[PDB]
Scaffold this motif. Structure first.
Motif, PDB file in Angstrom:
ATOM      1  N   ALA B  80       0.821  -1.205   0.000  1.00  0.00           N
ATOM      2  CA  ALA B  80       0.000   0.000   0.000  1.00  0.00           C
ATOM      3  C   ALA B  80       0.857   1.258   0.000  1.00  0.00           C
ATOM      4  CB  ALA B  80      -0.941  -0.004   1.204  1.00  0.00           C
ATOM      5  N   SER B  81       2.011   1.222   0.671  1.00  0.00           N
ATOM      6  CA  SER B  81       2.918   2.364   0.640  1.00  0.00           C
ATOM      7  C   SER B  81       3.427   2.629  -0.769  1.00  0.00           C
ATOM      8  CB  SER B  81       4.089   2.135   1.595  1.00  0.00           C
ATOM      9  N   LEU B  82       3.613   1.580  -1.561  1.00  0.00           N
ATOM     10  CA  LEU B  82       3.955   1.762  -2.961  1.00  0.00           C
ATOM     11  C   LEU B  82       2.796   2.443  -3.685  1.00  0.00           C
ATOM     12  CD1 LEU B  82       6.345   1.069  -4.847  1.00  0.00           C
ATOM     13  CD2 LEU B  82       6.496   0.018  -2.600  1.00  0.00           C
ATOM     14  N   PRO B  83       3.070   3.421  -4.547  1.00  0.00           N
ATOM     15  CA  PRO B  83       1.987   4.055  -5.310  1.00  0.00           C
ATOM     16  C   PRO B  83       1.306   3.044  -6.218  1.00  0.00           C
ATOM     17  CG  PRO B  83       4.127   4.701  -6.164  1.00  0.00           C
ATOM     18  CD  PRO B  83       4.378   4.019  -4.855  1.00  0.00           C
ATOM     19  N   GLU B  84       0.024   2.814  -5.959  1.00  0.00           N
ATOM     20  CA  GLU B  84      -0.739   1.850  -6.734  1.00  0.00           C
ATOM     21  C   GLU B  84      -0.867   2.304  -8.183  1.00  0.00           C
ATOM     22  OE1 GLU B  84      -3.749   2.539  -8.186  1.00  0.00           O
ATOM     23  OE2 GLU B  84      -3.911   4.568  -7.365  1.00  0.00           O
ATOM     24  N   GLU B  85      -0.990   1.331  -9.079  1.00  0.00           N
ATOM     25  CA  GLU B  85      -1.157   1.581 -10.507  1.00  0.00           C
ATOM     26  C   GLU B  85      -2.427   0.864 -10.956  1.00  0.00           C
ATOM     27  N   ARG B  86      -3.564   1.536 -10.798  1.00  0.00           N
ATOM     28  CA  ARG B  86      -4.847   1.031 -11.263  1.00  0.00           C
ATOM     29  C   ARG B  86      -5.275   1.680 -12.573  1.00  0.00           C
ATOM     30  N   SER B  87      -4.370   2.419 -13.214  1.00  0.00           N
ATOM     31  CA  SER B  87      -4.720   3.286 -14.332  1.00  0.00           C
ATOM     32  C   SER B  87      -5.483   2.536 -15.411  1.00  0.00           C
ATOM     33  CB  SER B  87      -3.452   3.904 -14.922  1.00  0.00           C
ATOM     34  OG  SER B  87      -3.584   4.089 -16.320  1.00  0.00           O
ATOM     35  N   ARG B  88      -6.587   3.134 -15.855  1.00  0.00           N
ATOM     36  CA  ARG B  88      -7.415   2.583 -16.916  1.00  0.00           C
ATOM     37  C   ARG B  88      -7.186   3.302 -18.238  1.00  0.00           C
ATOM     38  NH1 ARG B  88      -8.881  -2.538 -15.852  1.00  0.00           N
ATOM     39  NH2 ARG B  88     -10.927  -3.062 -16.736  1.00  0.00           N
ATOM     40  N   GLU B  89      -6.068   4.012 -18.368  1.00  0.00           N
ATOM     41  CA  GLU B  89      -5.749   4.743 -19.583  1.00  0.00           C
ATOM     42  C   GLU B  89      -4.393   4.292 -20.098  1.00  0.00           C
ATOM     43  OE1 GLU B  89      -6.258   5.538 -16.657  1.00  0.00           O
ATOM     44  OE2 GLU B  89      -4.964   7.080 -15.816  1.00  0.00           O
TER      45      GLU B  89
END
Lengths: 229, 230, 229, 230, 227, 229
Positions: B80-89
């Motif tokens: 969670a401390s790592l920046p999540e990458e959920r990007s849909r683009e």
DNA sequence: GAATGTAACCATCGTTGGTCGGCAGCAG
DNA sequence: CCTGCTGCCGACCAACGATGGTTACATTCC
DNA sequence: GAATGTAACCATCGT
DNA sequence: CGATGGTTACATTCC
């Protein structure tokens, strides 16, 4: 770097002893599965559904199910009936121009080093392929299964190195059946004109060192923080 | 065909809603182990070496081991401390010439189907990429893991289809450190010319329906003759 | 607030889905005519002169008149022949400077709300329009009757909103043909200064709350008192 | 050009006789309906849905419908109680800088001519408004309705004409209640830099002759060829 | 049964990986010096018979003395300038007709065993050599000495085996200078007819099993009594 | 040019006296190792290091391990059992056409000269063998050794000289019968044309003056410059 | 279908193990 | 004016040991 | 449910 | 004293 295959490129009277090296290596961090509390290692134990009994590897049989016809239960004898070919040949079939193989065919990459001290045969084939710009379609069997592959030569600076590209079989590629692209949409010449500056504004040349796997880099430093902590 | 990803190609004003389809399948026959004497399905049970106690999935934890430094447990909270990458683009970085990318970089391929009401943005973006003969280096995130990828256009008969090729990171390619090629071999034009007839005798255009996975074909038909008998 | 139009601003690569809201709503009161002795609503009945009988809407045809001609019969068949598109795209033509559009051109006003999962394209387009202080000239198409329109961005405090102003066509402005102003009249600076002083004596900033429709408020209070008895 | 309204500009001790013209006139073709079989002009007949009989205009009254508030009859003394609005004077109130009045404020436009042989007062007032850029907020009544109006000076070559812009009251202007724009997004300077060229590539100067009502011209040619076609 | 040398035959882009075997092994009984009484192997001692100094290996360099040039010493640095000839490939030079090569040159023979089952090149090379009937003159190096060699295929039942014969260098053959044959000697034509009947009197086909060695056969008979 | 063995051809009614000269002498330079400081001739000392017995030349007795180390002793009685082989003549067995004999048993070559002024006997024997194209198989008795040999005739320029080839015994030829050679694979006709073209490309004629021992020849130059220096 | 592990087996480099060599003595 | 015959000694092949790496395959997540 | 069309009236500028 | 364009208010195929 360790080799994974010691064979030879053979077509007719020609035979070039080579050693295969894996060209690419996934740099993603690989973890392990451990118990949450005691931090002990985790092992997988087989269990038959019918009896709940732990079974050894020697008691396994491959099975095939197709929708309804489940439990084909293929035995090891039937595999022996198949003409298994654990060959040590990179059997060359044809020579095609390098532009006739599109990028979606490529699967993996391997290096070819001249195994013996007599590298004249290796150099001559590489020099011929590079000069005439042709690619050889081969039957490359790495460990136990045969795969279609392509023989190509590319230069790493001052070295002319042959290389093997595993290919997907032509029937393994689906076709885009999208009806949306069938219809015609009218584009004004100005819009084509505009699409120019948008592309050329961001246009550049492929510089490999610009791209960095940011997520992996911060993952690595987080691990190092725990390692020292 | 079933889509695996629904998003858009965005690099500023431009935002083309597309759907991603897997371009390449795999025709290899996939088996699954069964108990020989029972013909029953096989399940995997996780056993912790420290105590032998059967461990449920929720009671697991990823660990990383490398030489010195043992039991380096990575907990969930650190992820969670790592920046999540959920990007849909599909974020576009830049446009490069089609020849500047090397064939060893590609590993997987996907199709792009326009998703918006009007496909004019998609169609015209394909038109300029082919006309300029350029790629598009993009950031592609399929399932919580960003991969470098390339955007290109192929002609499938009459249809013009955009295509995404996931690429290996540039540091994933090793260098051919072979000292053998460094030494220079003396050659004569006689053998250099002679190699022409050897190669050109087998020279041919790439014909797709000439190579078949004979082993799979024989394996496939062996299944049916076993299936009918019992 | 209910949307009157759902489309997208499109001029090539760019396609920003938006919803159009009526920025102005007149505050008058729409009275209904009723029978003096019955207080009943009246529905107009179409009576043809040449027939003297009530004609349904199905039997109605549009006619054009100009001097000598008069009965140019127009049916919807010719209307179909004339191209007529209800395109749901706000097509953009150029980006003129903001000051280049004279206030005599504006007709109506509308709001634009982003209508996508991500409003990045809408927000960034608004940001560049304001910082360059330019105006986009578009072809805004409401329910038929494509209209020339201008796209601008106005700050409603902490929110940056794009707006669409329908414009009259440049040929729709009459020519101020006044022979009186063609001739010149001698004027002395001495009394010019006096005209300046009186003008700036009444000068004041724009306070919208200072002006109200006083007549309408009196009309407003009149019919509620009657309603309450 | 025909005068719509003749009067003067109210200032207290200053009077500017003036005649009003319409600055804009819609060029759309206006159609009138005829019988589909007789080509006869239709004259509307007022029949009330309580007797099925025609009604003379002397026998109807305006009514306000608001929810349950039905059967609201307004007689002659109700609307006579309000003060008469017919005024032949343009009453000025204040003087505001031209940049303060918003483009969204404007509703209609009008022209002003000096309605006398002595135009010294007119050209005087235009001079002060020109050098000291200000707009005069006035109360303007055309026929029977009083509307807020803004007075400014515009130049056609060497001619200075004051133009009266009808302004809708500030209470008719809605407020954009969009929570979407309230939230802030992360944007990169590269994205802003990209927005420059695309805007600048299409950037131009406002040329009035470049835009024509293409539908109207195509429509216009349709009648005349029919008129010339018999 | 042991491969003395493993490599390949290369004449350009062609390369045939093979292993060599000694085609001929002498069956004559070879003895070594033994002590009649001590019954122990005699080990020689490197003793200089000019001053009595006992010498050991790894300390003495080669020497070359003849006629006028005496004690011309050669050390390990002089031969360093000589290029190494330890190439592990059989370099084919030409393909001369199989019949024009004189049987005077052959000294040793070898067998060529194919490599692993990837052995199409061997059968292909053997097939063409037997067809056009040519032998390839090659440069063959066993350990460190490069000797001229001829590559020839020949029939062994149903097996097609390629053999590497070795040839003496063309300068090793002396020129026969026999003045006794310079004079012309008349031969009687009747004697030629007489010789014609003589040659067919003993014209017998070569039977390898007709003639055996006698010395070796008799020696082993006596050893049987002892054992 | 020194003779090595003088005798006659045993034929019965014919007997041609003859001197024998060796045809070929190896030209490799033979090196003798000497002391770095004394340059003496290292004469090996034959002293048995099992009992300290200094065995003399006559004291030596050849022994063979044979099966299980049965190093049986041999005395003068044994050589008496074998027939005396001190004969100085050779005898002919049979006449075989030269095509029958193959060259894998050929090892050495020797010349022959007529030993009597009546050289007519020598040339007559040479003439018929050349006319018959046959090689006479003989037993050659060299210095304390008997070997199987094969006469033959060869013309050196205008000179006619008989030649003796001693052959390796037929029992000394190994059998190269391998299963790989027995195993047969499928050869397409396509590469036969290519294989033949490759071989014919490098085909030439045997000119003996084309090959010299370049390693050996230039070593002599190094010796020549070392002796001069 | 996608990532993410585990668990088989195979494979290349390592390095101790016997031959067959190419280089020298002696036979009147 | 030669030639047979052996150890001062030396580069050549197999049989297990460690270590990657491939292949197959279930288990989670749609 | 607004936007779009169209007819109805009376006010009004032009003689 | 005759015409034009201004407010009225009405029936429509609507995101």
């Amino acid at each position: 770097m360790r080799a994974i295959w010691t064979g030879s490129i053979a077509f007719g009277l020609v035979n070039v002893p080579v050693k295969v090296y894996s060209a690419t290596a996934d740099h993603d961090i690989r973890f392990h599965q451990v118990h949450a509390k005691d931090n002990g290692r985790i092992r997988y134990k087989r269990v038959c559904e019918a009896c709940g009994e732990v079974v050894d590897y020697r008691d396994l049989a491959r099975a095939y199910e197709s929708g309804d016809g489940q439990m084909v239960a293929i035995t090891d004898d039937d595999i022996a009936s198949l003409p298994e070919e654990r060959s040590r040949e990179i059997e060359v079939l044809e020579f095609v121009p390098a532009a006739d193989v599109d990028p979606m065919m490529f699967d993996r990459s391997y290096f070819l080093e001249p195994d013996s001290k007599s590298s004249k045969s290796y150099v001559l084939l590489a020099k011929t392929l590079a000069e005439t710009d042709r690619m050889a379609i081969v039957h490359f069997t790495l460990r136990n299964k045969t795969r279609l592959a392509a023989l190509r030569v590319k230069d790493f600076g001052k070295r002319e190195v042959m290389m093997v590209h595993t290919l997907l079989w032509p029937d393994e590629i689906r076709d885009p059946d999208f009806p949306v692209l069938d219809q015609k949409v009218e584009i004004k010449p100005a819009e084509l004109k505009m699409a120019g500056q948008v592309v050329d504004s961001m246009a550049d040349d492929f510089n490999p060192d610009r791209y960095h796997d940011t997520y992996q880099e911060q993952l690595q430093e987080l691990i190092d923080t725990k390692l020292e902590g």
